[PDB]
Amino acid sequence: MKLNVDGLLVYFPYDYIYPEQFSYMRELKRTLDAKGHGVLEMPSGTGKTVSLLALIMAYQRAYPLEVTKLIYCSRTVPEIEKVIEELRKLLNFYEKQEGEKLPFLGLALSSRKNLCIHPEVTPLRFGKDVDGKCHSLTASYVRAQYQHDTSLPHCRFYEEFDAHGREVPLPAGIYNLDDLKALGRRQGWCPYFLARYSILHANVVVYSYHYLLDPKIADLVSKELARKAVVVFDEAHNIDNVCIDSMSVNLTRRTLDRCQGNLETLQKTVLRIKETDEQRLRDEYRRLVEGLREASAARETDAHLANPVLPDEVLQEAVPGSIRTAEHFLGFLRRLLEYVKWRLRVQHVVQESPPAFLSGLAQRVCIQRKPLRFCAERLRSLLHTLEITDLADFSPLTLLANFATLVSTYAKGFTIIIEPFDDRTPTIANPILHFSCMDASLAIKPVFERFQSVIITSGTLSPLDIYPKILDFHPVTMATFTMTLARVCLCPMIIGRGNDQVAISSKFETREDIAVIRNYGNLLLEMSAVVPDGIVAFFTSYQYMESTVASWYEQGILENIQRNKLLFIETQDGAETSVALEKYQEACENGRGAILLSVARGKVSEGIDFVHHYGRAVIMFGVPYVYTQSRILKARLEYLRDQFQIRENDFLTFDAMRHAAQCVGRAIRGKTDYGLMVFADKRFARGDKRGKLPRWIQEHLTDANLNLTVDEGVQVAKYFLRQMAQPFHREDQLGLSLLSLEQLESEETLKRIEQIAQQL
Amino acid sequence: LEEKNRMLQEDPVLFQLYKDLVVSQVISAEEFWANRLVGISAAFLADVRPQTDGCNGLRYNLTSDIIESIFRTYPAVKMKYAENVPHNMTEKEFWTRFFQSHYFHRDKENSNAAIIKRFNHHSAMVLAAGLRIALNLKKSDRYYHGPTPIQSLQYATSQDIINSFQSIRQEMEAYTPKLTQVLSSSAASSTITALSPGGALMQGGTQQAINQMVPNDIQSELKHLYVAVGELLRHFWSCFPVNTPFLEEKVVKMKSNLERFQVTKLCPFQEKIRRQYLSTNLVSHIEEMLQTAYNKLHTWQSRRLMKKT
Amino acid sequence: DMTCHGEPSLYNSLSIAMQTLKHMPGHTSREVLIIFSSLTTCDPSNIYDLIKTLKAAKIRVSVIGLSAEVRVCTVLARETGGTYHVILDESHYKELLTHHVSPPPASSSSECSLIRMGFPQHTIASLSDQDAKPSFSMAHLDGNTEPGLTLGGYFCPQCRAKYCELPVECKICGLTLVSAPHLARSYHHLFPLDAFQEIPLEEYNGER
Numbered sequence A: 001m002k003l004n005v006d007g008l009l010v011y012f013p014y015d016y017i018y019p020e021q022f023s024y025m026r027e028l029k030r031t032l033d034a035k036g037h038g039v040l041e042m043p044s045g046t047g048k049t050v051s052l053l054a055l056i057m058a059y060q061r062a063y064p065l066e067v068t069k070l071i072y073c074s075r076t077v078p079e080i081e082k083v084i085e086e087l088r089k090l091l092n093f094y095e096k097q098e099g100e101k102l103p104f105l106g107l108a109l110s111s112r113k114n115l116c117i118h119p120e121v122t123p124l125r126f127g128k129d130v131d132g133k134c135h136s137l138t139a140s141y142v143r144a145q146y147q148h149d150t151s152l153p154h155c156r157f158y159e160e161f162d163a164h165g166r167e168v169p170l171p172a173g174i175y176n177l178d179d180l181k182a183l184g185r186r187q188g189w190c191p192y193f194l195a196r197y198s199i200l201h202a203n204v205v206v207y208s209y210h211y212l213l214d215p216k217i218a219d220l221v222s223k224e225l226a227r228k229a230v231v232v233f234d235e236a237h238n239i240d241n242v243c244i245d246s247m248s249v250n251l252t253r254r255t256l257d258r259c260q261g262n263l264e265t266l267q268k269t270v271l272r273i274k275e276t277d278e279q280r281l282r283d284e285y286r287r288l289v290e291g292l293r294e295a296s297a298a299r300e301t302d303a304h305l306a307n308p309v310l311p312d313e314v315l316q317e318a319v320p321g322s323i324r325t326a327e328h329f330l331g332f333l334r335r336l337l338e339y340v341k342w343r344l345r346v347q348h349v350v351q352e353s354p355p356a357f358l359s360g361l362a363q364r365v366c367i368q369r370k371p372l373r374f375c376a377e378r379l380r381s382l383l384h385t386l387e388i389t390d391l392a393d394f395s396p397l398t399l400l401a402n403f404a405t406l407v408s409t410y411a412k413g414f415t416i417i418i419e420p421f422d423d424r425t426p427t428i429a430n431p432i433l434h435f436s437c438m439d440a441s442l443a444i445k446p447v448f449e450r451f452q453s454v455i456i457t458s459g460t461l462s463p464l465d466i467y468p469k470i471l472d473f474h475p476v477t478m479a480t481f482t483m484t485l486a487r488v489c490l491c492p493m494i495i496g497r498g499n500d501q502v503a504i505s506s507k508f509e510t511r512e513d514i515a516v517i518r519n520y521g522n523l524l525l526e527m528s529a530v531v532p533d534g535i536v537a538f539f540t541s542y543q544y545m546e547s548t549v550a551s552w553y554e555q556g557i558l559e560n561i562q563r564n565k566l567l568f569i570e571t572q573d574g575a576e577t578s579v580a581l582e583k584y585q586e587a588c589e590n591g592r593g594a595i596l597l598s599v600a601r602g603k604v605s606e607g608i609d610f611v612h613h614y615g616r617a618v619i620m621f622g623v624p625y626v627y628t629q630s631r632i633l634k635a636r637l638e639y640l641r642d643q644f645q646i647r648e649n650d651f652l653t654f655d656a657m658r659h660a661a662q663c664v665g666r667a668i669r670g671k672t673d674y675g676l677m678v679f680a681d682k683r684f685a686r687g688d689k690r691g692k693l694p695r696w697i698q699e700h701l702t703d704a705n706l707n708l709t710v711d712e713g714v715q716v717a718k719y720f721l722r723q724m725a726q727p728f729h730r731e732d733q734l735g736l737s738l739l740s741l742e743q744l745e746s747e748e749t750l751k752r753i754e755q756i757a758q759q760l
Numbered sequence B: 001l002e003e004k005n006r007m008l009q010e011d012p013v014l015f016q017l018y019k020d021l022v023v024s025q026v027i028s029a030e031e032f033w034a035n036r037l038v039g040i041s042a043a044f045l046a047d048v049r050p051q052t053d054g055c056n057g058l059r060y061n062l063t064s065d066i067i068e069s070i071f072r073t074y075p076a077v078k079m080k081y082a083e084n085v086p087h088n089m090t091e092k093e094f095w096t097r098f099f100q101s102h103y104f105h106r107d108k109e110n111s112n113a114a115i116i117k118r119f120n121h122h123s124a125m126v127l128a129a130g131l132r133i134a135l136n137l138k139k140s141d142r143y144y145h146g147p148t149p150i151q152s153l154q155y156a157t158s159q160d161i162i163n164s165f166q167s168i169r170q171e172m173e174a175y176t177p178k179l180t181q182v183l184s185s186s187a188a189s190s191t192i193t194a195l196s197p198g199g200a201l202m203q204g205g206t207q208q209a210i211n212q213m214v215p216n217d218i219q220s221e222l223k224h225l226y227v228a229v230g231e232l233l234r235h236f237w238s239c240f241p242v243n244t245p246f247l248e249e250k251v252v253k254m255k256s257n258l259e260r261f262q263v264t265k266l267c268p269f270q271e272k273i274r275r276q277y278l279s280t281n282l283v284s285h286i287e288e289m290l291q292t293a294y295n296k297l298h299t300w301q302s303r304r305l306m307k308k309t
Numbered sequence C: 001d002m003t004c005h006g007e008p009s010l011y012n013s014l015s016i017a018m019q020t021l022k023h024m025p026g027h028t029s030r031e032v033l034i035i036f037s038s039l040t041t042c043d044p045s046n047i048y049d050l051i052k053t054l055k056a057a058k059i060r061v062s063v064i065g066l067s068a069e070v071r072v073c074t075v076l077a078r079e080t081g082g083t084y085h086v087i088l089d090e091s092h093y094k095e096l097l098t099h100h101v102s103p104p105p106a107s108s109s110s111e112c113s114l115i116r117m118g119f120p121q122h123t124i125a126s127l128s129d130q131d132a133k134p135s136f137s138m139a140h141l142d143g144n145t146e147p148g149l150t151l152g153g154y155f156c157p158q159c160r161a162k163y164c165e166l167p168v169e170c171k172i173c174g175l176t177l178v179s180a181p182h183l184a185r186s187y188h189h190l191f192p193l194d195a196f197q198e199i200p201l202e203e204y205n206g207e208r
C-alpha cells in the first residue's frame, strides 16, 4: 500500500494502516524536518516500529544526505531479531513493489558471545570468558608470533576476515545473527569482526542500549558514526536506570582480595619479564613520553579494554613521570588498594562526595588528581605491553582503576556509600562500596550534542515533562498519540476492597497483614475459576511474594487455585525460570490453565512478551514502590530534589507507575488482542497515583470500575470476556479503527487523525 | 477361553444364541467370533485427603486410580513402592509414612523456597505425564413435480368450455340462499347408513386378539429366531456387493449357515406351531426373508456366470 | 437428574467420536458439536495429534463455550472447518443452536456419490385376509421389553426386514428406508427465501 504523507511516498507493507500510525508518521516527518530530538508516546501493538522503519526508508530514499545512517537502540536480543525480521519483510515489499533489489544494507550488532564460531570458545557459559578466550586467540602480539609459528594459538575466523574479508564488503541486504553466523561459517570468517568492519557501510545499524549508552563501549560504535546520523530509542522508559548502572561502581571485600592477588601476580610477572627482557619497559616509557596517540591510533584491534569514558581533552595530556615507571605505578596501585581497604574497614555506613574523598586521599596517600586522571591509560598500556592473555582474572584491578579514574575526573552527581553490613543481613560482614551516579543525562549528553537527532519512544510515557528533566535536554516535539479503538480491548479495573471489605494496600506496614494475603488468595482463586488460562500476577517484592505464597499454602486456599489451574512461580535462577516460563506457555497452549506469579522488577516484566492468549489477565498487587532502605535511592532522590526541584515521593510514584504500566502494557498486541487489567490496591484510587498512568490506558480506565470488590471485579471480567469473545470482522474496523487506501484520501479522515494526537 | 466364556455369561441371550449356533453345528465358533470382533488432574493430592470417620476410622479408600496418578506424577513414589513393598514394608505402612513424611506435609525463606520448588516440580511432572462449492442446478422443474408420478391431468375441450364457464358465470350471477334443498330425509338416512357401524365408510371392524393365540414362550422363541436370522442376513448383505473373490466364499458359508439354522431350529419350531395348530403365519415372514436372500444369491451367481460367458 | 463432577475430557470424547465416525462413508458429512462449560480439560495424550487425525478424517467440529473463548478450542474449530461461539445468555444460546440447526456449506473435499435408497409403503395386514402375518419389529427387538406383535407396518423391499418406524435405515442390508415427505422436508434449504425490501409506510404510497 502506498501512502502520501505530507507529499512523501511511503511503501506500507500491509494492505491497511491505523490512523494512529498515520499520525505517528506525520509527527515523525515533522520532527525530521527540524533535525532535533523528539519524544513520542505510542500504544503497544499498534505497529509503530513498522511505520518508523517505513518513514526512515522513505527519507533515506528521498534524501540520503539528510539521514546518512539509521541507528536503532534496543533492549534484548529477541527485540533485535523482531526488528530485523520486520525490516527484511519491508525490504522484500519494497523490492516487489519496485521490481528491483534496492542497494540497502541493514546490520544487527551483538557481542562476541552471540557471534563466536570457534569450537573451543563455544562451550563457555559466560561472555566474559568468551571475550577473554577470543582475545587470547586473536591478540595482536599473538597473531604476529603465530605468523612465524602456526602451532601457536590462533582463531582462523578472524585471520581469514583480516586477509580476505576486508577487501570485499557485504552485499546490500539484511542479515540476522543466525544468518551472519552461517555466512561466517561459509566464508570461514568471524561474524563479529566482519560486522564491525561493515558498520561504516551498513545503512541501518541495530543494537542494544549497552553498546552505545555505556561510555566504555560507546567508541566501539560511535567512531564510525557521523554527525548526521539519527538515533532511535524504543521502550527507553528505563534508560536512566541503565545509564546509572553503567556509571555505578560496586566493590566488595572478595573483590579487594582478588585485586591484591592479581596485583601480586602482576608484580611477579613484571619482575620475570624485566629479568628476561628489560627493553620492553624502556620502550613503553618512550611511547608514553613521546605521546599516547602513537599506540592508540595504530592498533584498532586492541579495543578489548578501551576506556572512552574520559573526555577527549584529557587524552592529549600524558601520564605524569612519577608513575610512568611500571614499578612506580604498581606501588601506586598497591597504596591505592590499601587506602581503599582501610576506608572500607569502617563499621558504619559512610556517605561521601567525590571531592571530599579525593581530598582525603590526597592528604593521606599523597595522591594528586592529575596522576589519578590517567589511571586507565597507564593500566591499559601496562596490560598491553605484558602480552597478558587471561585478562579475566585481572578484571577487579581494571574495575578499581576505572573507579579511581571516575573519582579523579567526575565529581558532580556522584556519591560514595560505604556499607559494611548487608541491608538484608546486617549481621553478616559485607563491606560494600557503591559509587552511585545520580546524573544519567551525562551518559546521553554527547549523543544529543553529536548526532543529527535522537528518537525516543516507549509505551509507558505518562509524564511528558519529567523525561526532559531526567535527560537534561529540550526535545523538539512532545506528543502523545491517543489510542482509538472500534472495540474496547482493555478493561482496567481497580479493586481496593476485598471480600470482607478489607482495605487493600501494598505498604510495607500492610504487606505483612494476613487479611490482605487472604484477600489476594481469594481473588486469585476466583480469577482462576473464572478468567481463562492466561493469568499473570505481579507482586511488589520477592520476599513479599514468597511470604504470600507460603500463607496461601498454609491456609489451603492455594490448593483450590492449583486444582483450577496449574501454578508456576519464578525463582531467582533464570535457568529454571526459563523452564518454568516454557512450561507455562506449553500449558496455555495445551488447554490447561497456567498461572504465573512474578515480581514487577523480575525478568518477566523486563523482556517477556505475551501473545493474545498469554496476556488474558494481568493483575498488579499494589503499587510497586521501591524499597526505600537503599541509601542509593535516598541519595538519588535528594540529588534530584536539589537539582530539579522534584519531590522524592513524586519520583517514587512515577517509577512505580512506570513499572506497573510496563508489566501490564505488554498484554495487548493489536486490535484483535484483548486482555484484562486488574489493579488490586486502594492506593491506585489516589488522584496523583492514578494520573501517572499512560493516556491510552488511563482513558479506558472507567470510573465505574474504580475501587471495586472481588465479586464486582469477577462480574465485570465475565461481562468483558463474553462481549469481547464474540466473533468479529476486520471489515467493521474500516472507517472506525482501520483505514484502507480510499479512506486515507478522505480529508475528514485526515482531520480526525490530526484531532486524535495532542502535543504537550 | 476364559475371556470368551465371560462374554457369554454376561449376555444369556447371546450364550443361548451361541449354543444354538455352535453346539447345534449351525456355525463354527471361529466364524461366530470372527463377526463379533484418562487425563491427569492436579487435584489428586489436595482433594484426596485421609478420611476421618466417626470413631477413629482412617478410611483410606486407596483406589488404584489415585495410586496410578501418584506414580505418574511422582516416579519416586513408584520406586519406593517397588523397592519396599511388600518386603521392606507393607503398603499401608508405606502410605502412613508418606502421610507422616515431609513429602506430603510440606508446611521462613527456606520453607517458602521449598514449597515453591515442590509446586514447580509437581506442575512440571504433570505437564510431562500429560503427553505420555457453489451449486447451480439445471432443471428445477423436477422439484415442481417431484416423486409424485404422472397424474391424470386432462385438458378440457375447445372454446366451448369457456361457454360453460359463461354458463356458471350466468348461473350463479343471480343466486339466492336455500335451506330445504340443502338436505333431505332420504339423504340423511343414507348418510347415517354409510356412517353406521358396518357400513361402507366404517371400513372393517373389530379384530382378533393375536396376543392370546400365540403363547408367550413361542413369542420369545420367535423373537430369538428373528434376531438370529436378522444378524445372519446382515452379515450376508454386508459382503454384498461382492467385489472380491473372498466375499464369494464368505457368502457361500453364510448361506450354508442359514440353511443349517433353518433345518436345526426353524423346522422344529414350525412343528411346534403345527402341533399347536396356530393359524398365525409367524414363520411366513421368516420364509419370505430366507427366500428373498436365497433368490438374491442365486441371481448374483447367475450374473457372475453370465459375466464369464 | 445427573451429577456434575470432575473435569471435562475433550481428548477422550473426540477419540470416541472419531472411532465411531471412522467407518462412516466419505460422502456423509461428519459434524461434531461440543458444549464446553469449564475452561480447562485433561488430555491423556497430545491433542494436536488428534486434531491432525480429525483434519485428515474430514470431520467438522464446532464448539460453543459458556464462560469465555478458548484458544485451543478456537484453533481446533478453525482447522476442522467448524465455528466457535461464546454464550452470552439463554437467548443467545438458543440463537446459536438455531443457527447450527441449518446444514453447514459443503467444502471442496466433500464427496458426491450416487447413494441408493428404498421407499417402502405402510404394508398393513388385515386379520380377515388369509395373508395376515404378524411379526415383531426389528427395532423393537433391540429393547429389553417384549416387542409388540404388529400385524403390519413397513417391510424392506431389499430383504423383507420389518420396521415400525421411519425414516430408519434398514439394519440388515444397510438400505436407507425413507419417504417422499422426508426428502422434500429439506427442499427449503435448496431455495432460500430472500429478504424483502423494507420501505416505511409513509414512504410507500400503495395498498394499505
Ligand code: SF4
Residues within 6 Å of the ligand: A112, A113, A115, A116, A117, A118, A121, A133, A134, A135, A137, A138, A155, A157, A158, A190, A191, A192
Ligand atoms: S574471533 Fe570470532 S569465532 Fe574466534 S573466538 Fe573470537 S568471537 Fe569466537
Ligand SMILES: [Zn+2]
Residues within 6 Å of the ligand: C156, C157, C158, C159, C160, C161, C170, C171, C172, C173, C174, C175
Ligand atoms: Zn433391508
